[PDB]
Scaffold this active site. Structure first.
Site, mmCIF file in Angstrom:
data_model
loop_
_atom_site.group_PDB
_atom_site.id
_atom_site.type_symbol
_atom_site.label_atom_id
_atom_site.label_comp_id
_atom_site.label_asym_id
_atom_site.label_seq_id
_atom_site.Cartn_x
_atom_site.Cartn_y
_atom_site.Cartn_z
ATOM 1 C CG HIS A 78 -2.414 -0.313 0.493
ATOM 2 N ND1 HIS A 78 -3.239 0.714 0.027
ATOM 3 C CD2 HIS A 78 -2.956 -1.501 0.126
ATOM 4 C CE1 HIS A 78 -4.264 0.106 -0.579
ATOM 5 N NE2 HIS A 78 -4.149 -1.221 -0.520
ATOM 6 C CG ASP A 125 -8.991 6.884 7.882
ATOM 7 O OD1 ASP A 125 -9.300 6.991 9.076
ATOM 8 O OD2 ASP A 125 -8.542 7.818 7.201
ATOM 9 C CD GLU A 129 -10.355 10.083 10.026
ATOM 10 O OE1 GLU A 129 -9.743 9.074 10.443
ATOM 11 O OE2 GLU A 129 -10.615 10.282 8.813
#
Ligand SMILES: *Cc1cc2c(cc1C)nc1c(=O)[nH]c(=O)nc-1n2C[C@H](O)[C@H](O)[C@H](O)COP(=O)(O)OP(=O)(O)OC[C@H]1O[C@@H](n2cnc3c(N)ncnc32)[C@H](O)[C@@H]1O
Length: 514
Positions: free
Chosen positions: A88, A152, A271
């Site tokens: 990632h 997340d 957030e």
């Protein structure tokens, strides 16, 4: 006496074929395996020819990884070795050009009971370094338990996030994922397997946490667990400006015991995000504001084994909808299960994949900056550089939840003592879809960095990427403490003196000098 010239694929293949012969580990040198191991989330090409490794190593046991690291470090010309989680990374962090990529997923032979062992009495889970956070979640929920700190996006590895920090909207309260680890099993660059914690080999433990894979490979992490809630009341509130958004986020993340405040201790997650580019209503308010809108996102957990009841939730939402300075009529509230909330981004990934918009280049930029400059940053970047894709996240965290002994770098100097408790993260998470998007977005990223350096805004990269040790030392580790770079080098000499680990991070390219 031996040449310093990089070990060839011929020398590497001979060493690793020896390992395939003496262990249950498997080796692939074919173009398909090496092409996959040459790329990451930053690109959508079939192969990155420059980043191609000589081979991919599929360990059966953590001892196979130890044999590989020892074999490379003790050889005449040590070869690069890099662990790959899910790749990632966006800047080649998990690549081993002309070296060996370790397919961490192979240890699970990814969800496997053996790799996700829950201790109900100890309130912890022993998770394999290759395991995905989504699988850690499900394994813990089966026993009414949960990790306290998240990312997340849950389809990331335990070892991968712990090598960075692992941040999400719960970090203001429990700290990042690196602040929620009891112990690690680490395979050092020298090829030793060491179990470490605050009580044993704390130097290795703290080095590895936020250590960008420079000191060793995490094969196990013991993660503490809390009683699990059943559901979450999820709020999305529109704001017309950065001033009220940030001021309200800070009220919500305040330490309830120490600082307090009317809105402190209500949210379990906080957030925020910026929207630069009920749809007709939002678009109408956007023109009135000046083309830029903001969102505050929050969640209150309840039910299950939590102390918060469904009645408590209604009372908290009432307080927040009255006291918060969001745009009236632009409050969106949803009720979901605790698992649905944590795994919320999966619907986003599925949607993007279905539109062919997932496997595209991702020129991402993640920054940490002090609270004192967040409004100056918002004015120059959100209302300047990024003024008209993908999400742009913005939210504060509490420095006190981060351990200064680890490798993780925040925008504070260790010698300055207790300055501002609050700092922000900004995540510019755009996707290059149309022609010319990649070059444009990469230039805008460089422009954000140049703008900060010019405006004197201290800016620290999360998932950092620098080409020179001068930048790593003076720009990245240096403004964080007079001994941060010296500590990083001391740990490097101890745990990976041949500097073979994660050379794609570009901190070290050659063995450390005497
Ligand atoms: C792609 C992505 C990333 C992401 C995200 C959403 C998406 C779609 N949301 C994030 C979030 O909300 N919060 C956060 O903290 N990070 C978020 N990210 C970024 C992500 O954390 C990083 O990409 C990170 O690298 C984890 O990804 P992954 O597990 O895939 O790891 P990797 O890219 O292969 O490797 C990263 C570095 O660590 C080294 N490495 C890999 N595994 C290990 C182990 N077991 N031990 C030690 N080092 C390891 C690699 O060599 C590389 O240097």
């Amino acid at each position: 006496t031996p040449s310093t010239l990089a070990a060839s694929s011929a020398i590497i293949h001979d060493i690793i074929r020896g390992l395939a012969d003496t262990t249950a580990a498997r080796v692939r040198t074919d173009a398909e395996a090496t092409a996959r191991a040459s790329t990451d989330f930053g690109t959508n090409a079939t192969a990155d020819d420059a980043a191609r490794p000589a081979a991919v190593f599929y360990p059966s046991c953590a001892a196979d990884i130890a044999a590989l690291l020892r074999a490379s470090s003790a050889s005449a010309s040590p070869f690069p070795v890099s662990a790959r989680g899910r790749g990632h990374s966006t800047r080649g962090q998990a690549t081993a050009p002309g070296g060996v990529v370790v397919d961490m997923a192979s240890l699970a032979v990814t969800s496997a009971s053996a790799r996700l062992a829950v201790s109900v009495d100890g309130r912890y889970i022993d998770a394999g370094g290759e395991q995905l956070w989504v699988d850690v979640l499900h394994a813990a929920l089966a026993h009414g338990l949960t990790p306290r700190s998240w990312t997340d996006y849950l389809r990331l590895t335990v070892g991968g996030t712990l090598s960075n920090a692992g941040i999400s909207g719960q970090a203001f309260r429990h700290g990042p994922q690196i602040s929620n680890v009891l112990e690690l099993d680490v395979v050092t660059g020298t090829g030793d397997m060491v179990t470490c914690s605050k009580e044993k080999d704390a130097d290795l433990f703290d080095a590895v946490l936020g250590g960008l894979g420079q000191f060793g490979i995490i094969t196990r992490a013991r993660i503490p667990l809390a009683p699990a809630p059943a559901r979450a009341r999820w709020l999305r509130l529109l704001y017309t400006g950065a001033a009220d958004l940030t001021a309200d986020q800070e009220r919500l993340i305040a330490d309830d015991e120490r600082r307090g405040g009317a809105l402190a201790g209500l949210m379990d997650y906080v957030e925020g995000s910026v929207v630069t580019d009920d749809a007709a209503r939002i678009a109408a308010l956007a023109e009135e504001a000046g083309g830029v809108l903001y969102f505050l996102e929050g969640a209150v957990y309840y039910g299950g084994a939590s102390d918060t009841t469904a009645a408590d939730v209604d009372k908290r939402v009432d307080v927040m909808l009255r006291e918060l300075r969001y745009a009236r009529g632009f409050a969106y509230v949803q009720d979901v299960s605790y698992e649905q909330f944590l795994d919320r981004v999966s619907a986003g990934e599925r949607r993007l994949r279905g539109e062919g918009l997932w496997d595209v280049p991702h020129p991402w930029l993640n920054l940490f900056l002090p609270r004192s400059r967040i409004l100056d940053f918002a004015a120059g970047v959100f209302h300047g550089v990024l003024l008209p894709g993908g999400p742009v996240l913005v939210y504060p965290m509490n420095r006190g939840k981060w351990d200064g002994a680890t490798s993780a770098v925040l925008p504070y100097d260790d010698g300055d003592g207790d300055g501002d408790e609050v700092f922000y993260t900004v995540g510019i998470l755009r996707s290059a879809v149309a022609d010319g998007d990649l070059r444009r977005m990469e230039e805008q990223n460089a422009e954000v960095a140049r703008f900060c350096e010019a405006a004197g805004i201290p800016c620290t990269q999360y998932l950092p990427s620098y080409a020179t040790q001068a930048d790593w030392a003076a720009r990245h580790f240096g403004p964080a403490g007079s001994g941060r770079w010296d500590t990083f080098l001391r740990r490097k000499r101890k745990y990976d003196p041949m500097a073979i680990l994660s050379r794609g991070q570009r901190i070290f390219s050659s063995p450390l000098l005497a």
